[PDB]
Amino acid sequence: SGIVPTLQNIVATVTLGCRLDLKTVALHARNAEYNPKRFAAVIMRIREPKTTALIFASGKMVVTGAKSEDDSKLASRKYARIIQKIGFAAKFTDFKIQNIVGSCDVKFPIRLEGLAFSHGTFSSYEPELFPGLIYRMVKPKIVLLIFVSGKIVLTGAKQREEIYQAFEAIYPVLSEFRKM
């Protein structure tokens, strides 16, 4: 015992409280992308912090790339500003981290087919497309990627406590079906 999951990035959603014109938002934004073949929203991006974000015409936008709360709190303000700096009336509220990303190594390889045979009612493993394993932690609800290499990822958490728990919950499941 002694690994602890390390935070790698975080994702939060923000709302301007006002609708915007994706066509003009991407045309007025110095760093934005609008692909009508993927969806109906724009994609902003800044190098300080180096993160990315996608705003919707409904004002609701999602920002990702931060590694903590203060990291995302600043990235969002910058995006919401690009809109007000463009002339729109975007605001800065409804900010909340709904997904935290973490990762760590158990120091040993794990049997991908062993975990899928013990938790087939929750774990997933497709040797025809994904050589890694995907465990959908029941509580909290999070997805953990485990590769024979020993790399464990944890995304979908809603609070640092979630990522630290998801690992403390599957930590044993892996040690029980380790490979070495």
Partner: protein, 67 residues
């Protein structure tokens, strides 16, 4: 006259800052042949990880279906 299944592919958005276009990125940069970050086993898988469970976290970061 429409499409089936509204929403964008954010399987990577929750995996580590990505461009809704499906481009996953990393707040930090790495110029080595192997360091912090996932190799090329997840990036190419994320584009297709929306068929085992990420589907939920897929539409959970881009509710672009109300305009």
């Amino acid at each position: 006259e429409g499409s089936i299944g509204n929403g964008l592919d954010l399987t990577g958005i929750l995996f580590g800052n990505i461009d809704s276009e499906g481009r996953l990125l990393q707040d930090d940069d790495g110029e080595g042949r192997g360091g912090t970050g996932f190799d090329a086993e997840l990036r190419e898988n994320i584009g297709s990880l929306s068929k085992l469970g990420l589907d939920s976290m897929l539409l959970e970061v881009i509710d672009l279906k109300e305009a």
